[PDB]
Scaffold this active site. Structure first.
Site, PDB file in Angstrom:
ATOM      1  N   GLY A   1       0.813  -1.210   0.000  1.00 44.55           N
ATOM      2  CA  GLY A   1       0.000   0.000   0.000  1.00 44.55           C
ATOM      3  C   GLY A   1       0.845   1.258   0.000  1.00 44.55           C
ATOM      4  N   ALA A   2       0.383   2.317   0.687  1.00 38.54           N
ATOM      5  CA  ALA A   2       1.135   3.571   0.781  1.00 38.54           C
ATOM      6  C   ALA A   2       2.449   3.371   1.550  1.00 38.54           C
ATOM      7  CB  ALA A   2       0.295   4.637   1.461  1.00 38.54           C
TER       8      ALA A   2
ATOM      9  N   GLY B   1       4.376   0.893   1.334  1.00 38.48           N
ATOM     10  CA  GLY B   1       5.291   0.204   0.436  1.00 38.48           C
ATOM     11  C   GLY B   1       4.948  -1.268   0.365  1.00 38.48           C
ATOM     12  N   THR B   2       5.891  -2.149   0.734  1.00 40.93           N
ATOM     13  CA  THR B   2       5.672  -3.596   0.719  1.00 40.93           C
ATOM     14  C   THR B   2       6.276  -4.213   1.980  1.00 40.93           C
ATOM     15  OG1 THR B   2       5.805  -3.526  -1.695  1.00 40.93           O
ATOM     16  CG2 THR B   2       5.992  -5.706  -0.674  1.00 40.93           C
TER      17      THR B   2
ATOM     18  N   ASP C   1       1.220  10.171  12.036  1.00 39.91           N
ATOM     19  CA  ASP C   1       0.442   9.179  11.290  1.00 39.91           C
ATOM     20  C   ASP C   1      -0.163   8.109  12.219  1.00 39.91           C
ATOM     21  OD1 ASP C   1      -0.679   8.049   8.995  1.00 39.91           O
ATOM     22  OD2 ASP C   1       1.191   7.153   8.263  1.00 39.91           O
TER      23      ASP C   1
ATOM     24  N   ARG D   1      -4.516   1.378  11.246  1.00 41.34           N
ATOM     25  CA  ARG D   1      -3.673   0.698  10.257  1.00 41.34           C
ATOM     26  C   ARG D   1      -2.188   0.659  10.687  1.00 41.34           C
ATOM     27  NH1 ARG D   1      -5.134   5.601   8.058  1.00 41.34           N
ATOM     28  NH2 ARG D   1      -3.415   7.088   7.756  1.00 41.34           N
ATOM     29  N   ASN D   2      -1.731   1.640  11.500  1.00 45.89           N
ATOM     30  CA  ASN D   2      -0.353   1.720  11.982  1.00 45.89           C
ATOM     31  C   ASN D   2      -0.209   1.277  13.444  1.00 45.89           C
ATOM     32  OD1 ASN D   2       0.501   2.733   9.446  1.00 45.89           O
ATOM     33  ND2 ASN D   2      -0.240   4.750  10.022  1.00 45.89           N
TER      34      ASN D   2
ATOM     35  N   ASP E   1       5.143   2.447  11.741  1.00 52.60           N
ATOM     36  CA  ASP E   1       5.176   3.358  10.605  1.00 52.60           C
ATOM     37  C   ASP E   1       5.601   4.754  11.013  1.00 52.60           C
ATOM     38  OD1 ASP E   1       4.670   4.790   8.128  1.00 52.60           O
ATOM     39  OD2 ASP E   1       3.351   3.146   7.505  1.00 52.60           O
TER      40      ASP E   1
HETATM   41  C1  LIG Z   1       1.154  -5.781   6.195  1.00 49.39           C
HETATM   42  O1  LIG Z   1       0.807  -4.442   6.442  1.00 49.39           O
HETATM   43  C2  LIG Z   1       0.237  -4.240   7.717  1.00 49.39           C
HETATM   44  C3  LIG Z   1       0.386  -2.727   8.003  1.00 49.39           C
HETATM   45  C4  LIG Z   1       1.766  -2.121   7.645  1.00 49.39           C
HETATM   46  C5  LIG Z   1       1.669  -0.573   7.793  1.00 49.39           C
HETATM   47  N1  LIG Z   1       2.933   0.139   8.030  1.00 49.39           N
HETATM   48  C6  LIG Z   1       4.070  -0.432   8.593  1.00 49.39           C
HETATM   49  O2  LIG Z   1       5.044   0.283   8.819  1.00 49.39           O
HETATM   50  C7  LIG Z   1       4.002  -1.851   8.871  1.00 49.39           C
HETATM   51  C8  LIG Z   1       2.907  -2.627   8.485  1.00 49.39           C
HETATM   52  N2  LIG Z   1       3.105  -3.887   8.961  1.00 49.39           N
HETATM   53  C9  LIG Z   1       4.315  -3.976   9.664  1.00 49.39           C
HETATM   54  C10 LIG Z   1       4.701  -5.224  10.319  1.00 49.39           C
HETATM   55  C11 LIG Z   1       5.660  -5.229  11.341  1.00 49.39           C
HETATM   56  C12 LIG Z   1       5.880  -6.388  12.088  1.00 49.39           C
HETATM   57  N3  LIG Z   1       5.235  -7.552  11.867  1.00 49.39           N
HETATM   58  C13 LIG Z   1       4.334  -7.579  10.865  1.00 49.39           C
HETATM   59  C14 LIG Z   1       4.040  -6.452  10.074  1.00 49.39           C
HETATM   60  F1  LIG Z   1       3.141  -6.593   9.107  1.00 49.39           F
HETATM   61  C15 LIG Z   1       4.901  -2.684   9.612  1.00 49.39           C
HETATM   62  N4  LIG Z   1       6.072  -2.202  10.193  1.00 49.39           N
HETATM   63  C16 LIG Z   1       7.369  -2.528   9.771  1.00 49.39           C
HETATM   64  C17 LIG Z   1       7.643  -3.550   8.852  1.00 49.39           C
HETATM   65  C18 LIG Z   1       8.949  -3.872   8.538  1.00 49.39           C
HETATM   66  C19 LIG Z   1      10.016  -3.195   9.109  1.00 49.39           C
HETATM   67  C20 LIG Z   1       9.756  -2.189  10.019  1.00 49.39           C
HETATM   68 CL1  LIG Z   1      11.106  -1.468  10.804  1.00 49.39          CL
HETATM   69  C21 LIG Z   1       8.455  -1.827  10.354  1.00 49.39           C
HETATM   70  O3  LIG Z   1       8.200  -0.805  11.237  1.00 49.39           O
HETATM   71  C22 LIG Z   1       8.178   0.476  10.629  1.00 49.39           C
END
Ligand SMILES: COCC[C@H]1CNC(=O)c2c1[nH]c(-c1ccncc1F)c2Nc1cccc(Cl)c1OC
Length: 292
Positions: free
Chosen positions: A21-22, A24-25, A133, A137-138, A151
């Site tokens: 999404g916004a 990234g991945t 933010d 979702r975050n 996030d």
């Molecule tokens: C799959 O998207 C869900 C929301 C998405 C929305 N924004 C994010 O920032 C984030 C999401 N999922 C996870 C995530 C973390 C840990 N375990 C599982 C997960 F899915 C996020 N953090 C994240 C992921 C990888 C590295 C880092 Cl350092 C992160 O912190 C910024």
């Protein structure tokens, strides 16, 4: 002082896509540290390089002491793109979790999540960090009883002699922002309190979209007319008044995160008094636009 642990791509295995999404991945994997053989489940993020490294700096700056309700960066990986690494949260984001387990979430969990998000935000306020933010979702779910804020893409650190952050023309979430952030691009810890109120409203409505059907350009005029998000059916007047106090015109009159910890902790001690959900005793558990 902020320190990053550069981790090799050979240390990560079984990389599977979780979502996109916004942000990234985001992927999932197993990090085997050099020398050690403990397979630690981790999450990896991608998106341009300037933006992801700012997020790494912000997360590494607020890593010591650290808070249990704030995601901490384990390190970064340098593949074709720069990737962020963190401990995996098996139950995903809380916005999806509240939409999936609609008929299984009790009042104790909803109030404890409000306490935990306020504890994490109070820690970030102490480290001079404005998240910019805060949304359902975050917020991630480590286990049903434990949540973490994530996030730090729009997050900004404030200097010793700096009580506000003025953004330029970057995309921002209007339906979670405070009125002063929409009108004058001003971001303070009290503007994050407005977003906290919208996040609490999202959990109390089990993942309803705020101001659904209303375009983002009509939000500033709607908030100036005194209009606010509606009272969720499960909320008593005491819970809804906290949300309305988070959305007051005067930012200093809004509650503080240290006050929201106390207020929601008091409510968590007698949860059925403050939230009315049918079959509460039987329950059990194991967007961004250009401003103008
Ligand atoms: C799959 O998207 C869900 C929301 C998405 C929305 N924004 C994010 O920032 C984030 C999401 N999922 C996870 C995530 C973390 C840990 N375990 C599982 C997960 F899915 C996020 N953090 C994240 C992921 C990888 C590295 C880092 Cl350092 C992160 O912190 C910024």
């Amino acid at each position: 002082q902020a320190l990053l642990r550069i981790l090799k791509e050979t240390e990560f295995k079984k990389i599977k896509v979780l979502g996109s999404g916004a942000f990234g991945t985001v992927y999932k994997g197993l990090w085997i540290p050099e020398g050690e053989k403990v397979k630690i489940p981790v999450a990896i993020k991608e998106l341009a390089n300037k933006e992801i490294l700012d997020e790494a700096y912000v997360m590494a700056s607020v890593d010591n002491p650290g808070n249990p309700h704030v995601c901490r960066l384990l390190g970064i990986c340098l593949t074709s793109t720069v990737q962020l690494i963190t401990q995996l949260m098996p139950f995903g984001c809380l916005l999806d979790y509240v939409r999936e387990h609609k008929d299984n979430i009790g009042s104790q969990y909803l109030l404890n999540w409000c306490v935990q998000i306020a504890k994490g935000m109070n820690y970030l306020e102490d480290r001079r960090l404005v998240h910019r933010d805060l949304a359902a979702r975050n917020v991630l779910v480590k286990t049903p009883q434990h949540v973490k804020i994530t996030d730090f893409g729009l997050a900004k650190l404030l200097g010793a002699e700096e009580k506000e952050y003025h953004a330029e023309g970057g995309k921002v979430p209007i339906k979670w922002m405070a009125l002063e952030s929409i009108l004058h691009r001003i971001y303070t810890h009290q503007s994050d309190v407005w977003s906290y109120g919208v996040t609490v409203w999202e959990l109390m409505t089990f993942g309803s979209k705020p101001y659904d059907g209303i375009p983002a350009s009509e939000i500033s005029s709607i908030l100036e007319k005194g209009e606010r998000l509606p009272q969720p059916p499960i909320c008593t007047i005491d819970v809804y008044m906290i949300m309305r106090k988070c959305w007051m015109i005067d930012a200093d009159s809004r509650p503080k995160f240290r006050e929201l910890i106390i207020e929601f902790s008091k409510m968590a001690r007698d949860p059925q008094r403050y939230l009315v959900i049918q079959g509460d005793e039987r329950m059990h558990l194991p967007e961004y636009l250009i401003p103008q």
